[PDB]
Write a protein that binds this ligand. Structure first.
Ligand SMILES: Cc1cccc(-c2nc(C(C)(C)C)[nH]c2-c2ccc3c(c2)OCO3)n1
Length: 303
């Protein structure tokens, strides 16, 4: 029969995605993550399997895809996605559970930038990678590995660009992602969605919000902040598009950069990246590659 899903034994319920339910599984002795969709969730399943099967997608800071499969238990067909297990889980869960070192922060920050710069960069060739925008970049969708670098999951909302024709592989809706991480252009309806660079610019904003969440947990000599989500101070816990538009577009607040980040050098680089990631004009924002370059300077420096 089939060689993946037949041979996997589910052990623990991890939790829900947007669609489909996440499990700890044993494959051939090794631990795996399994994500399971109903027969009516087939568009979501297929599209996510389509993105992970993009040629040249595999980076150390993208989640390692094993396989899409079917599994008939006897009553009903389950649609499976199988991946690498990471015991720490999400960047959200890690930053709630733990503080980090100075070296710890940059490992989390660099890897997330490297992941998105890989995802964004077109690789021309016969085995050629399309440029890929995420559309839902957040701490819940980034996983943390056992080495303490990150990898990006939740590519099911992603869009892919052919540079020759200048087309996106789907006709994209307004307002698909997590409402809290939606960029100002996405919030106020103003984003042009036959411009591909705009979707990349929308991802850099949200990585800025992820970079804030990490930098709060940086324990220099006692002193760290608590875990918070971006706009904990300014919106409710499941916030509306209306509620988010009033803070980000109308009032023009980033997340608040505290005083003691000015003392340490590594936090000021991160603080400068954050405030260069927030910008209501998307064209003002940095590339993931310029962020990757800058953090890779800081990594190969301070003694
Ligand atoms: C393509 C694929 C296959 C299997 C799992 C996941 C997946 N989807 C998500 C969310 C963010 C909820 C959409 N998380 C995972 C995930 C992946 C690996 C894990 C894990 C969860 O817990 C520890 O190890 N995606």
């Amino acid at each position: 029969g089939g060689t993946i899903a037949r041979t996997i034994v589910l052990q623990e319920s991890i939790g829900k995605g947007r669609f489909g339910e996440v499990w700890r599984g044993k494959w051939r002795g090794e631990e795996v993550a399994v994500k399971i969709f109903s027969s009516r969730e087939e568009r979501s399943w297929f599209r996510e399997a389509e993105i992970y099967q993009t040629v040249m997608l595999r980076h150390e800071n993208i989640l390692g895809f094993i396989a899409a499969d079917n599994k008939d238990n006897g009553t009903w067909t389950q649609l499976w996605l199988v991946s690498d297990y990471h015991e720490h889980g999400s960047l959200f869960d890690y930053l709630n559970r733990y503080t980090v070192t100075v070296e710890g922060m940059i490992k989390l920050a660099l890897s997330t930038a490297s992941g998105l710069a890989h995802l964004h960069m077109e690789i021309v060739g016969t085995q050629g990678k399309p440029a890929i925008a995420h559309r839902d970049l957040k701490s819940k969708n980034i996983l943390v590995k056992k080495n303490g670098t990150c990898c990006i999951a939740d590519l099911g909302l992603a869009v892919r660009h052919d540079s020759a024709t200048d087309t996106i592989d789907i006709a994209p809706n307004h307002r698909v992602g997590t409402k809290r991480y939606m960029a100002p252009e996405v919030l106020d309806d103003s984003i042009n969605m036959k411009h591909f660079e705009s979707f990349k610019r929308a991802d850099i904003y949200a990585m800025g919000l992820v970079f804030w969440e990490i930098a709060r947990r940086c324990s220099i000599g006692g002193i760290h902040e608590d875990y918070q989500l971006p706009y904990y101070d300014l919106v409710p816990s499941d916030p509306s598009v209306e509620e988010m538009r009033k803070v980000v577009c109308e009032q023009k607040l980033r997340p608040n950069i505290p005083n003691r980040w000015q003392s340490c050098e590594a936090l000021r680089v991160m603080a400068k990246i954050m405030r260069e990631c927030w910008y209501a004009n998307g064209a003002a924002r940095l590339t993931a590659l310029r962020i990757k370059k800058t953090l890779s300077q800081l990594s190969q420096q301070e003694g």
